[PDB]
Amino acid sequence: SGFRKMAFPSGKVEGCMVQVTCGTTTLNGLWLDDVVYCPRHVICTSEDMLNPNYEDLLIRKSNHNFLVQAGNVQLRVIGHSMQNCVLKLKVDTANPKTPKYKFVRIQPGQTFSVLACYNGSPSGVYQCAMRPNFTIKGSFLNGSCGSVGFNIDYDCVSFCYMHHMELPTGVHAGTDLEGNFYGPFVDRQTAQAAGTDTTITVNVLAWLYAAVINGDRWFLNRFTTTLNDFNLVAMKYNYEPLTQDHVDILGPLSAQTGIAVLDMCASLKELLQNGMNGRTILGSALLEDEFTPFDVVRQCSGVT
Amino acid sequence: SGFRKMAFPSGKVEGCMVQVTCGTTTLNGLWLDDVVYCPRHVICTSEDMLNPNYEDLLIRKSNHNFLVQAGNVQLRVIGHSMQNCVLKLKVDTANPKTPKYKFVRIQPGQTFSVLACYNGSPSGVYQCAMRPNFTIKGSFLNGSCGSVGFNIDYDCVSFCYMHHMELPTGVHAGTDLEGNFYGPFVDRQTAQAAGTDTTITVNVLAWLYAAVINGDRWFLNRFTTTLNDFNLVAMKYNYEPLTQDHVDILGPLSAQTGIAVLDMCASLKELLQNGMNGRTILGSALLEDEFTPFDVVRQCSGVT
Ligand SMILES: O=C(Cc1cccnc1)N1CCC[C@H]1c1noc(C2CC2)n1
Ligand SMILES: O=C(Cc1cccnc1)N1CCC[C@H]1c1noc(C2CC2)n1
User: Fold this and answer.
1) I want to staple B110 with a disulfide (CB 3.0 to 4.6 A). Which of B10, B106, B223, B230 is the partner?
2) Number of domains into which chain A is organized
3) With contact defined as beta carbons under 8 Å apart, do A6 and A292 qualify?
């Protein structure tokens, strides 16, 4: 028992981290097979960042301007290209530590682990969720760009995120591994406000099921509700509307605990309406929404 | 910016995890050089667990009864011995992935990362603190025994914890890598209640400094206090007494923010006395105590 914000083991990803330098800018790169993936803003100077013309900036760059270092050894760059907001640097050596991998674009509400890196070196690993407004509430400092988000299915690493920037609001924006930003964000140092950060309702319910499994049951009540009644409450509290797809995904947790999804929605409704009254659930004094139903099942079953 | 419960990258530790089986019991082992470390209760049957005589149980075991598997390859066991509550299985092959390592016995209040494992395979990584009552609030299921806690200083992995058991209270107990339990716990399935779980005051203050650095400043007040006045409040709220050693350790955070340690104690005093009033600090609705002052500096400076 016990329930923690758990990240995937980061070993497979640590073996892919490299340092990429272009001019006076150094950030992180992801070396998979014979390609190094990194944010295209590596070609920018501090002046360029305000309104960069990436196509024009890249014309002035040759393969030899991209310095790629894997630990203490320099990789030879034999090609470069821009795909959306990422650069793909073709190197002459396949990464011997390349794990089995996929590139996936995640949905808002999905969680992933981040291996924060500086100068191609890992500093820490933490669990994240892609917010409904497509930002991530990470922990990143200048130099962390190019750090990646991922999930792992046994031996396959699914890369879903590459860190690009911090919004003036202190939240983070980035792309999938094809270089497409999550949300409306652009790789430019300009005012980019995030939309309403709604709560991921299906995740809060999944976390309430994890609480019941682990012994924290005080919030269980004598009530039930309907999807429509629940959603009136979810709208008032800036929670995502719950759909029948969400109920279906919560099915295994509902079956394991014997608590119908709509009964758990009624417990959630009372918690939204009344608050926690100074009580805690799984050591938290607020409703946690960065555990998906899959995360709860994985953690509560011990999947390796 | 942003502040997360960050674990160390787990790669160096993943390379050490093996599966150890003795009879019908399988748990995790730590392979460093030519030795595999694991909880001695691997020699117990379910009946034995109630009151085991480990010395007598071990007499019936030979090197060939300890099955040690590293991934899909079997290690040959050439010696076995019991050191306190751990078994050391001498194998004929040095682990090629052995990192630079140390065995350290941590102090209550210190934090570490846990690589939870099942059948010698890593499932996740999370950040922990050794509670003042010497328990850890982990996330561990049956089969997780032998999973280890550690810290990393650049290239050196300091192993501090090996998981042994779950108390009837759902909290976790284990040993250092010399097999000595943290706290009064014994490796026996018996009633072992934990003492008062006090709050790690120096860590809460470190986390308040992290909040100020990251922009969350609402809790800063116009007051100050003294160590003695602060400690009267800390005692009432089951917080650890703050010492001048703690103030000294908070020195760099105090210098960076310009907020004197005693002024931050006065903010903490008001937060204990008044609560958060439905507000949050670094996305938390309670006072977080599982970040040491070193963790805050490391995360806020980007140490790799
Ligand atoms: O956000 C960062 C880096 C950073 C800092 C903290 C956390 N995570 C990332 N920066 C640094 C330069 C100014 C600003 C910036 N604005 O746009 C860009 C890129 C073109 C997209 N960069
Ligand atoms: O605690 C665990 C395993 C477990 C389960 C959940 C989390 N972490 C560890 N068990 C399983 C058998 C009964 C009980 C037990 N009591 O003592 C022992 C060892 C002799 C010390 N084991």
Assistant:
1) B106
2) 3
3) no
- Taking the CA of A146 as reference, the closest ligand is 1
Look up residue B184 and give its amino acid: P
- State whether residue A232 is helix, strand or coil: helix
Q: Which chain B positions have a beta carbon within 8 Å of A302's beta carbon?
A: 116, 118, 123, 141, 143-144
Looking at the fold, whether B8 and B150 belong to one and the same domain comes out as yes
Residues A85 and A109 in one domain: no
Q: Which residue of A has its CA nearest to B120?
A: A304
> Same domain for A95 and A186?
no
- Strand A25-32, strand A35-39: pairing: antiparallel
Q: Which residue range(s) make up the domain with B256? A: 198-301
Where do runs of H (alpha helix) occur along A107-224?
201-213
- Residue entry with tokens 């005080």: A218
Resolution (A): 1.6
- Residues in Cβ contact with B60 at an 8 Å cutoff, skipping those fewer than 6 apart: none
Q: Is the CB of B115 inside 8 Å of chain A's CB atoms?
A: yes
A vs B: CB pairs below 8 A = 147
Instruction: Specify whether B107 is located in the same domain as B247.
Output: no
Phi, psi (degrees; rounded to nearest 5) at A117: -130, 150
Between chains, do B9 and A126 touch, taking CB under 8 Å as contact? no
Helix (H, G, I), strand (E, B) or coil at B77: strand
A282, B266, B286 from B278: Cα distances, Å: 18, 20, 10
Q: How far is A270 from chain B (nearest CA, A)?
A: 16
Residue A141: both structure tokens together: 């400092």
* Token duo for residue A188: 């430019």
Name the domain boundary from A99, A121, A139: A99
Gyration radius of chain B's alpha carbons: 21
Could you tell me if B7 and B144 lie in one domain?
yes
Q: How far is the CA of A212 from the centre of ligand 2 (A)?
A: 21
**Which of A174, A197, A220 is the last residue in one of the domains?**
A197
Q: Is A89 exposed, middle or buried (0-12, 13-18, 19+ CB in 10 A)?
A: buried
Question: Domain containing B141 — which CATH number?
Answer: 2.40.10.10
CB atoms A214 and B170 under 8 Å: yes
User: The dihedral of CA A159, A136, A286, A221: what is its sign?
Assistant: negative
Which of B119, B123, B207, B217 to mutate to test binding with chain A, by most A CBs within 10 Å of its CB?
B123
Which pair of tokens denotes residue A101?
């991998």
A299 and chain B in contact, CB less than 8 A: yes
Report which of B154, B281, B121 is spatially closest to residue B209, judged by C-alpha positions: B281
CA distance A77 to A219: 58
Task: Verify that B141 and B152 share a domain, yes or no.
Answer: yes
Query: How is residue A136 annotated by DSSP?
Result: B
Same domain, residue pair A220 and A272: yes
Do B128 and B25 reside in the same domain of the chain?
A: no
How was this structure determined? It was done by X-ray
Q: How far, in Å, is the centroid of ligand 1 from the Cα of A55? A: 19
